[PDB]
Amino acid sequence: ASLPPVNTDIHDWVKTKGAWDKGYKGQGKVVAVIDTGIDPAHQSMRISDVSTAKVKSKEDMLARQKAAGINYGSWINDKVVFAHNYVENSDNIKENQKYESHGMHVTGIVAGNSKEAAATGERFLGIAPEAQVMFMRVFANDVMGSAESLFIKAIEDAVALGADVINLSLGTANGAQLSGSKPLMEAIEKAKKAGVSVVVAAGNERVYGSDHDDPLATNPDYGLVGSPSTGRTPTSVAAINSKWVIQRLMTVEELEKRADLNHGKAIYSESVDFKNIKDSLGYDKSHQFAYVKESTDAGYNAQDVKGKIALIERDPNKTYDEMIALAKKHGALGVLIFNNKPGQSNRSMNGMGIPSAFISHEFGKAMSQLNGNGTGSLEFDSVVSKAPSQKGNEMNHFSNWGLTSDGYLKPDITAPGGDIYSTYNDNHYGSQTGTSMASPQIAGASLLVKQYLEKTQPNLPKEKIADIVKNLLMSNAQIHVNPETKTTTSPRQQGAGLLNIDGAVTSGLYVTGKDNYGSISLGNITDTMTFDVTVHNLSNKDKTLRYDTELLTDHVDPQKGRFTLTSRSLKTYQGGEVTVPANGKVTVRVTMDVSQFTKELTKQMPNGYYLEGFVRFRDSQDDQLNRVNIPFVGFKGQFENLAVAEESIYRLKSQGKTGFYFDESGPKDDIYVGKHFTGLVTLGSETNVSTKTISDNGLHTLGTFKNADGKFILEKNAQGNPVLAISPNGDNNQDFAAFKGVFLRKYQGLKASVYHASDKEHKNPLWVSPESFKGDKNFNSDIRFAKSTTLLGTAFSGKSLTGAELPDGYYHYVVSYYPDVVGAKRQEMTFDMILDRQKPVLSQATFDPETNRFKPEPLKDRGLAGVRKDSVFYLERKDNKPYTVTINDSYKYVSVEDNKTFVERQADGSFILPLDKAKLGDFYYMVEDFAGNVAIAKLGDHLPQTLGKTPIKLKLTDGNYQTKETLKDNLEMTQSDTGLVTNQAQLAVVHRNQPQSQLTKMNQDFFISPNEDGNKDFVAFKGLENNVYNDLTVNVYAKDDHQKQTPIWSSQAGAGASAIESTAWYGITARGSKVMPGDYQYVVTYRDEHGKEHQKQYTISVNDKKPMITQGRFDTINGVDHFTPDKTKALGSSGIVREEVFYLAKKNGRKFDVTEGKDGITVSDNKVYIPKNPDGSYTISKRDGVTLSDYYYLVEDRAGNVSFATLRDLKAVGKDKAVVNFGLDLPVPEDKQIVNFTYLVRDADGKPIENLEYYNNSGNSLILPYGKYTVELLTYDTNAAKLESDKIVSFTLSADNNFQQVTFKMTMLATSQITAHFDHLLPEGSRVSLKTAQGQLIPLEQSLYVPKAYGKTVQEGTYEVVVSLPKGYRIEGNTKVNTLPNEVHELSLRLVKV
Ligand SMILES: [Ca+2]
Ligand SMILES: [Ca+2]
Ligand SMILES: [Ca+2]
Ligand SMILES: [Ca+2]
Ligand SMILES: [Ca+2]
Ligand SMILES: [Ca+2]
Ligand SMILES: [Ca+2]
Ligand SMILES: [Ca+2]
Ligand SMILES: [Ca+2]
Ligand SMILES: [Ca+2]
Ligand SMILES: [Cl-]
Ligand SMILES: [Mg+2]
């Protein structure tokens, strides 16, 4: 034919045609695209001449599938020769959106091959139009736990069926190169060895803080490159913006003759919120407009109010809505805001509170339309046009940057990802932006460089080939120059440069540093950079090249102290010439003294800076052919040791500074707990004098207190300092303190320790958090990404490693951690901390009867916290009672507080009491310390009845209004009883208040469920009332410890047979960790009056699993619904001991109710019970106001675990239907568990079941007809847990077994870090390994940034550092370590010679 022309907007730039014209189009290669969707009907989806393809027919395929075990997924046509949906286990591979399919677009880019024209009039091709496509539909739901296993099957399938390259969009911000998820890394190594190029988008988060503000110059570790592409084997791809852009434009023909404005044709950007221009003004219809100066009202009133689309420049003060709305007010019809900054890329507003005028941003100050001076006409194109782009040849804003988390240079290379036009569904095309557009450009190009290498170097093995495909692509790339600043683009942003395909299949040169890689990561840099660059020549003629090295660093806006993410050029240090043998290599030695720049740069980057850049090679004769180059980066400083956390908001405020994400709005020194800072947090709860407080107040920043307005304020003591103090007394007011961090770098090994503050060197921990934590920097790339993280696992509560109470005193609470670089130093951060459990001093005061002046003694605390506030209040009666009860009808919540009203405090320290407003003696005086201890005297308590007189001295004592609740006792012990006691409470069903609990005897069913639900949470011992129990100890022993010799929890000193709490075991170790389900020996020992030793032994069982309610039966009897639950079994620890049917009656409009008992207020569900009939049915009756979803069935096991279901939910099961439920069986507490996993159920022929119905609102419980089935575990968090039982389980539903329980038994995974640190660098030829318990070797390799150190992350276990060592050498030091979970273990080892 005479075919439409090809769009070379991208090919001209990346120089594709230099490869096409040498016969490299992808013919007989295959790209495996792992991604979201694909339409293989698309006209683009085409091969020319199947005869030359890798796979020549639908049968060549079924011949490849069975060949390697793939029993699933079809061949579709000559182009898309394999496709399987790995999420469903489906062959539904096409997405259904607005034709907008991501994976469609990606495939268009790598291998589109259309003959037809898109809407421009051109036809579009990929980099490899003649390559074949296998598509793996693979994508992630949170609901899975980990989609990784799916990606690995797609990778392994792709390899097996014979791909040449794989294209992944997959990414996890702040990847490491050496420690990504190992199952996925190894899958990738496996493709490399099969000669597969693994090409991965680098991510779209850009850099730390990117949704907030540019990064502080004290924080150079701002990189965020993706978790798989950051690995050494993949090719990791950054994105540049296309120079040409295909969009609907706007045209004023009255500006046709301005050729620098694309002939009167503008790029307009409406806000992502609204986008109302097409639907409100309509394409292809012409409208008036009128320049408005000044978006006030003045500006010629409203000339642009008749029909004119209003045209206004941006007022950087007035907001986008103060503008659109003010225009719509004057009659707008729709407004254009044209940019105030000249030459700038159309700011993105979003901004849509009060739009409704149909608005857009017109390109720049440029495109100020001033024809006939304000008046003009304009229309909106309905078809897309080619336009110069307002941001072409710029790095795309969001391409990931920086180094990998562990210090390596990535990404590797750049390609066009901004505004790329490619294929959508249903013969549509569209344009779309991101680093995963750039990635298929490079996937395509490595198709072609592979074709080449295969023709031109046929003696290259599978294993070596993908690594050379990469090294050519990089080394031949065009080093990009930032156009706004005229400086080389950072290699941390652009990699080895912009893609140059021709260069790569033409020059036959590539470059390599010492590490045999197309880029160079030097580690730390010290006043002298020396390194070895190596050029390689695949030609059999030869090349002579002249070279020179440009050295860069990061520019810093000195007004702001923030990186600008642009590079400044230091010095193009000069090189030389060298000649590169045919089929050989030559090595040159670059050397630069940078001593010169240290002072100027250390001044603006006090924690160090990057020294990076390129080494350029040109042909010595003609400097435009044989252009190749290598990137490098080092760190002037100690990259491994950069601060991991931002400094504490305390220290920063104290030195006039602020947090990177800290919102300083509000009253001076407000630290509301929802802001973002490093700090400590604690729980508060109010003190009430007229009723028992029934709920706490939530977390607040420790050291802050509500001021009059209820904002929480960092108060200072007399010396002008905040006070970090907790009062671990049981009252839930500041009883604990926990670390909250704003993390700057990825952290690992994080724990909390408490030392006595006179233990200055932190050598004797008194308490350590039971676990250790690890996590990500708070990079905040958009709203979904936390600006701070709270680690409640670091809660300290004044108990020690033993559970003993640590005395009131002055301690250091030390949070320690490590960055993710081997060899780094442990970073501590210290909080001075008071343990004070003592209320302030209530002495006496001077009341004078006619000045009405109450003045108390000056304020004195007991303990170190210090008095913080002085108060007087009375209880204003209201609805006749001194407190108000408040029922949050929507959250089903009740709260109660005093009607406290406060008397102002005159500056001299006293109070003028309003006795018009209540009696003296109904006023309370209150003194609070900084730890939360609260003293309150009711001053009437010590009033003389001689009221009116002359000034009297009044005695004040505390009323113990702030105390810890205590549990209702009521119990009388006979000698019959065991001695054991536990607690009893019902489970709320509607209200979310804490149900009333009270003590109960325990003379059977020795089983507890430590879940803090009120019911059987502990085992305490209570003695006969007149018996004596001297020296009373409880110890708990594991079942292994049959000699009862090493306790795992013991009563603290001073426990007594009648203080129950002192004796209560809550299934917890001495450290306060929940014990595992199992049996334990609870041993009570005491001496009586006579000194005879007594011991009472009991076997307690711990188990907190909720019971599983099965669907029962329903029958109609005398016209009334009858419910018959299935027979519960009673076989111990889980057997049912309580069975209820009830319903909730509405009263006062709701289903719960408040009752004002003698102590205080209590909340209950309006429960009404249904007698069990003698046939085991319950009669579910008529009852005005009550529907079947108001009737419940409830069960309790011997442990006190409770479950319930509405009868509506149980009745949704047909009478012929059965129910199967799937779950995981982990040997840990319910709060320590995965719940996330997906599964496939197949019917008796192997067909996936369709049209799912769920049982009792659980997506792990299905309603199915009777039959044979199988279930297969699809996904689960494989970093957290290992499957142990069968992955496929067969089961049969039937009217007898109409409820099946299928569980996948699992074990749980725990890692540790090990670092071996040496004295002096080890001699050449030494090898370091970890030797495992079974005798195997785990090789370690030198740390880049810390070369005396070798480390790895391992499975929790016992290891020994073995070292191989030549000549006469020896290692001394402890080489053995028993790792702990999430811990970091350092072995300092010593190298010795003679
Ligand atoms: Ca196409
Ligand atoms: Ca408080
Ligand atoms: Ca307290
Ligand atoms: Ca070390
Ligand atoms: Ca105190
Ligand atoms: Ca107060
Ligand atoms: Ca319980
Ligand atoms: Ca289906
Ligand atoms: Ca160092
Ligand atoms: Ca463990
Ligand atoms: Cl922004
Ligand atoms: Mg912005």
Automatic annotation (TrEMBL):
The positions annotated for binding Ca(2+) 5 are 756, 759
Q: Which residues bind Ca(2+) 4?
A: 727, 729, 731, 733, 735
- The record lists Ca(2+) 6 as bound by 836, 838, 861-862, 929
Binding residues for Ca(2+) 8: 1009, 1011, 1013, 1015, 1017
Assigned keywords, A-Z: Calcium, Cell wall, Hydrolase, Metal-binding, Peptidoglycan-anchor, Protease, Repeat, Secreted, Serine protease, Signal
Q: Which Pfam families match?
A: fn3_5 (PF06280), PA (PF02225), Peptidase_S8 (PF00082), YSIRK_signal (PF04650)
Query: For Ca(2+) 2, which residues are the binding ones?
Result: 235
Entry's Gene Ontology cellular component terms: membrane
**Which residues are involved in binding Ca(2+) 10?**
1356
GO MF annotations, alphabetized: metal ion binding; serine-type endopeptidase activity
The residues that hold Ca(2+) 7 are 928
Give any single GO term for biological process: proteolysis
- Matches recorded under CDD domains: PA_C5a_like, Peptidases_S8_C5a_Peptidase
Annotated Ca(2+) 3 binding sites: 638, 640
Q: Which InterPro entries has this protein been placed in?
A: C5a/SBT2-like_Fn3, C5a_Peptidase, Ig-like_fold, LPXTG_anchor, PA_dom_sf, PA_domain, Peptidase_S8/S53_dom, Peptidase_S8/S53_dom_sf
**What positions does UniProt annotate as the active site of this protein?**
35 (charge relay system), 102 (charge relay system), 436 (charge relay system)
- Where is Ca(2+) 9 bound in this sequence? 1317
Q: Which of this chain's residues are annotated to bind Ca(2+) 1?
A: 223, 225
Superkingdom of source? Bacteria
**Member of which family?**
Belongs to the peptidase S8 family.
Output this protein's name: Chemokine protease C
Which species is the source of this protein?
A: Streptococcus pyogenes
